[PDB]
Chains A and B, each alone.
With several copies, the nearest count.
Chain A
Amino acid sequence: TRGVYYPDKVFRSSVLHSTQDLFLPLQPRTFLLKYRVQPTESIVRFPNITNLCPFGEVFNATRFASVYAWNRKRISNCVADYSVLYNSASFSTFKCYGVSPTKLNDLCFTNVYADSFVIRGDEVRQIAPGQTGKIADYNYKLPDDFTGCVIAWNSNNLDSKVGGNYNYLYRLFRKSNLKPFERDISTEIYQAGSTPCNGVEGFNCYFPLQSYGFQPTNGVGYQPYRVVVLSFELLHAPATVCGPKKSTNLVVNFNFNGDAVRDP
């Protein structure tokens, strides 16, 4: 019973402190200080620093879908780096309700879904939890509790034909509001009155979809803003998305992807 030194420097008094340090039975072992096989090594293994998430195939794409039928994508088994937040390109907005993007890197998440669509300039606000408008009633509805990140930017040059890009449409007339994240892609004839018109688009029967008028010589308010909505969820098996962290060798204390586990 010789050689018990002072592990730390924090002044303690009359508090029994269990400590895991190197002592003489030098070897690692745990001691109780008065004022069973011990893990001989600690190893950590995170996914290799390659194989990044296809943020390009979501942000830099040829065509985004219309808002009535948005495009949903699931990215997983990648080391996501969140360098998008820097305005490397034009980035009008960056909201990130519920989770801090700055400190987001250190955490390990599950299947961050990305939703992409094109909307008009005024209505970008309506993509928020607790909005009431044509977009957030019949086209795309956000849950009351949201843990994601709304990204919107302007691209006048790609979406404004001098004739007019009329290929972008949205749903105007619907029977009832949309449950969170429900896509209702239909081309029925809305019965706005007691006229059984059997799909003839006559008096009191309209067509729900209606095009968007886009012109380069137009105001900022009526311009095409492309939007992408990152949605982070976490349930089980977090061995999917995991922020970049270095790893060690494999042989004990273990830390695998944040009774059987598959080494990434």
Chain B
Amino acid sequence: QMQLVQSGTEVKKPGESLKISCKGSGYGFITYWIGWVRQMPGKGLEWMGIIYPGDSETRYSPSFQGQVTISADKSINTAYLQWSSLKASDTAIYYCAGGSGISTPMDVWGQGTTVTVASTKGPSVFPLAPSSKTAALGCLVKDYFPEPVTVSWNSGALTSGVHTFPAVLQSSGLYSLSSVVTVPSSSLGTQTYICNVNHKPSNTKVDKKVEPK
């Protein structure tokens, strides 16, 4: 069983040209028909194309026929998926999977590489106050594009009862996200709360205290 190692994660602006490599390592790699599959966020898989390394016979899908180009290089055992001009709807995760013949289920799957196409906007973090009269407290990240934002509580010291909610895109486009912890009313006075918001595309690392009002 020969494993497949993928090239890596690329972030690109609209209008560029993008080449993704699938590398095949292992013995017996004389008959593996490489195929590509794309998973959009939180959706089902959609098969794209299949190429035989070497001979280079290439079969496509009707939806994707001609949008992208699948090519193979036999000497180093690689498969390339190329976009001539990627749009802003191509943000998704791509998996290269290798079958052993035509009409054979795909059994060896590469890790997969995400693609993000967008313009970075940093996160405005605002802390909610715990109601004066257990009780809950948390800080509310807003207007951050694109996903993801990492919210770590007290440099990772606190982990019990920490609810992190998936980002929901409202009209402006910029997703919002709220993370809330539950604390008994005994530790409210003494224990200090610092949420750490990391947005790497905008390179914004903020440490914001949660204050009881």
Contacts and interface: CB of A to CB of B under 8 A. Distances in A.
- A touches B in complex, CB < 8 A: yes
Interface of A: 85-87, 91-103, 122, 125, 134, 172-173, 201-206, 210
Contacts, number: 61
Contacts of A172: 13, 15-16
B68 to A, nearest CB: 16
Interface of B: 1, 13, 15-17, 27-28, 30-31, 52, 54-55, 99-104, 119-121, 145, 173-174
A86 B27 contact: yes
B103 A210 contact: no
A134 B15 contact: yes
A210 B101 contact: no
A100 B100 contact: yes
Shortest beta-carbon contacts, A-B, top 6: A100-B100, A203-B121, A96-B101, A94-B31, A100-B104, A94-B30
B101 A98 contact: yes
Contact of B28 (A86, A97, A203, A204): A86
B55 A100 contact: no
B80 to A, nearest CB: 10
A264 B165 CA distance: 65
A160 B194 CA distance: 45
A95 B54 CA distance: 11
B100 A96 contact: yes
Contacts of A95: 31, 52, 101-102
A97 B102 contact: yes
Nearest to B145: A203
Given A86-B28, A96-B31, A102 B100 contact: yes
A206 B13 CA distance: 9
B119 A206 contact: yes
Given A86-B28, A96-B101, A201-B119, 16 more contacts: A87-B30, A95-B101, A97-B102, A99-B104, A100-B100, A101-B101, A102-B1, A102-B100, A103-B100, A125-B55, A172-B13, A173-B15, A203-B119, A203-B121, A203-B174, A206-B13
B106 to A, nearest CB: 11
A91 B52 CA distance: 15
Contacts of B13: 172, 206, 210
B103 A97 contact: yes
B54 A93 contact: yes
Q: Which of B1, B17, B101, B104 has the most CB of A within 10 A?
A: B101
Contacts of B99: 100
Q: Which of A86, A91, A102, A206 has the most CB of B within 10 A?
A: A102
22 contacts: A85-B31, A94-B31, A95-B101, A96-B100, A96-B102, A97-B101, A97-B102, A97-B103, A99-B101, A100-B100, A100-B101, A100-B104, A101-B101, A102-B1, A102-B28, A134-B15, A172-B13, A172-B15, A203-B173, A203-B174, A205-B119, A210-B13
Given A85-B28, A86-B27, A173-B15, A204 B119 contact: yes
A92 B54 CA distance: 8
A262 to B, nearest CB: 33
Contacts of A100: 99-101, 104
B81 to A, nearest CB: 14
Contacts of B103: 97-98
Nearest to A202: B121
Contacts of B104: 99-100
Contacts of B174: 203
Given A97-B102, A100-B104, A85 B30 contact: yes
Nearest to A102: B100
A99 B120 CA distance: 49
Contacts of A205: 119
A263 to B, nearest CB: 34
